[PDB]
């Protein structure tokens, strides 16, 4: 049975970056040629793993994280990066061993008048640990006065909405990102590639 790589790539709906989805690839064989042959990817950068050699390898588990961000924020999805997304939404480890695949999705996730379903986190006390997911909607206390769940002065809702419209600039157009993380623990490797003995 093949690994469900098309299940996360050609999915009709994606998640917001603060609530990024994760598919745990386990107990299947992969066909990484299908990922490389697709020339519609505007961003395809692999850190650590060799893409061609990746075919003839095995791993304990694989993780496919999917979300949508802006165009000018795709650079933040990289090991050792800083910004709003990399610190309060989705953080990659500095020793990351995987691939980041991002493609423009203005013709899918954009709506005239504004697609306000995709959100991101604006305020957060501490940065996000690698592969951490914070989906809390607690009113952020920006001052010394408690908020008590009510929004007001120095009490901000931590989630900002992307104004995704088909007429936006390239930097503000929606981009779908898929991050593949190959975890090789001291366990039976159950996710092998095409050329495995």
């Amino acid at each position, epitope marked *: 049975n093949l690994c469900p790589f098309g299940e996360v790539f050609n999915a009709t709906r994606f998640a917001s970056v603060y609530a990024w989805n994760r598919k745990r690839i386990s107990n299947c064989v992969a066909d990484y040629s299908v990922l490389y042959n697709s020339a519609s990817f505007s961003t395809f950068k692999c850190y650590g793993v060799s893409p061609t050699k990746l075919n003839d390898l095995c791993f304990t588990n694989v993780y496919a994280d999917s979300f949508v961000i802006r165009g000018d924020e795709v650079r933040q999805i990289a090991p050792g990066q*800083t910004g709003k997304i990399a610190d309060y939404n989705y953080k990659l480890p500095d020793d990351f061993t995987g691939c980041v695949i991002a493609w423009n999705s203005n013709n899918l996730d954009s709506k005239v008048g504004g697609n306000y379903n995709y959100l991101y986190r604006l305020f957060r*006390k501490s940065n996000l640990k690698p592969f951490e997911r914070d989906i809390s909607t607690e009113i952020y206390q*920006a001052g010394s006065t408690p908020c008590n769940g009510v*929004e007001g*002065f*120095n009490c901000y809702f931590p989630l900002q909405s992307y104004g995704f419209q088909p007429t936006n*600039g390239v930097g503000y157009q929606p981009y779908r990102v898929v991050v593949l993380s190959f975890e090789l623990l001291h366990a039976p490797a159950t996710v092998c590639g095409p050329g495995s003995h």
Partner: antibody
Amino acid sequence: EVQLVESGGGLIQPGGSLRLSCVASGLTVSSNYMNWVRQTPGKGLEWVSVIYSGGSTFYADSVKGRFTISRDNSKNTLFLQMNSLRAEDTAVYYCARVGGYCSSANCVSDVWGKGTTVTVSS
Amino acid sequence: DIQMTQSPSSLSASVGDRVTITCQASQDIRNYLNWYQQKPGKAPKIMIYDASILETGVPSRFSGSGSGTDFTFTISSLQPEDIATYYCQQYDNLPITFGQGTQLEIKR
């Protein structure tokens, strides 16, 4: 209201250093996007540095490598260290929380300080 | 970076006249644009949030409109309590950029 009282501006020879301080009242500097912005009388307003609540810092190209933004949560004060000061850095510096990111009901309050004059000459 | 162009750099208008100031961004900034008013000697005060939102305390004669790459700041009936330098600022994209400025002069 929110008060941002600043200090540290003064005469400094080229190449010297200077630490600008900005004490806040009614605002937690460790929980906001705090910005340093200098205004030359001839050129206008110019963004200098920003620090995030999580600790991330960013500086402008005319400023990178020379300045450094930081904060002290116990004193609730925003600091801007300036090294290798050039004559072009002569301006009035402000600390502020740039407002915006408005929802339908609430906005982030935009509050600027009073400003300190940093002069760089021989 | 995003270059902000503010027009005009200086304008003179009588009391009660309609004042209009245009601002253009080098690229799309959506509605993330603020308008500041700086009195002579004072610090820049926030005047318009996110192109259209009016700061509390600002009179109703002030107004703001526009989106994308073109914005306008309008004063319906000018009063002498408004003479200052006005700036348009874009955030959400570092470096935060401002306009060149617009001096306001009351004709008499």
